[PDB]
């Protein structure tokens, strides 16, 4: 929201560039970062988990 959270920003950058996520999945995680910045670290882990699970078959 208003103030600079380093983990929120870093999480946002990574999720933006995760190669295996769809558009809707990407928007969902980024929306969670906006709504709930205090759990940015856990949101990123869930995003990476989904990204790796959807790695090119």
């Amino acid at each position: 929201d208003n103030k600079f959270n380093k983990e929120q920003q870093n999480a946002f950058y990574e999720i933006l560039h995760l190669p295996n996520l769809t558009e809707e999945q990407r928007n969902g995680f980024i929306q969670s970062l906006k709504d709930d910045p205090s759990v940015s670290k856990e949101i990123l882990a869930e995003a990476k988990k989904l990204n790796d699970a959807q790695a090119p078959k």
Binding site: G28, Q31, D35, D36, S38
Partner: protein
Amino acid sequence: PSVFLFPPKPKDTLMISRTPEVTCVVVDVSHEDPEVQFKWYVDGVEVHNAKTKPREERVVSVLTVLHQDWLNGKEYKCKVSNKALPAPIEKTISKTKGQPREPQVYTLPPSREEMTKNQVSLTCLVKGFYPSDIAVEWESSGQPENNYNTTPPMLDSDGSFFLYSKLTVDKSRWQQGNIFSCSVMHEALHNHYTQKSLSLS
């Protein structure tokens, strides 16, 4: 001069019978000049219904809030004055923003493996809820069952939250068909509460 600010209990904000309150706590105060003055603000407008508990050897201030104001995302802020400290210290708290989502409540019976034991575990899975503010209780035939523990909410895959609640009961009570029920309280629930029962087939 540390300044901490806590939200009301999830149950207090949801149940009209209960009284929700925001709490402004402080430690490391000057024994030199240990008076301290709180000035509260709701959405940027000053209120005066706050009460300061007697000091301790910790000075805490309690502001009572309207259930609906907290649930509608109003901002609360206490200004802490003190002559033995530079300028005042402002801190703000609010309910977590974001689209609320309804919890899914599932009761799970004890594993067949646990039946060898004297006491068995009654499990309640609560998932898919947002924000994380939630309350959980157990009861049996009207009366409260207090021998339970509920994990804090944990972030799930889809950004929502989940938790588990474990009620421990004597195997005897479970095996003679006693009815147990878990009640969950969340803003995205109808009437802010629901209950699910669990019993032997």
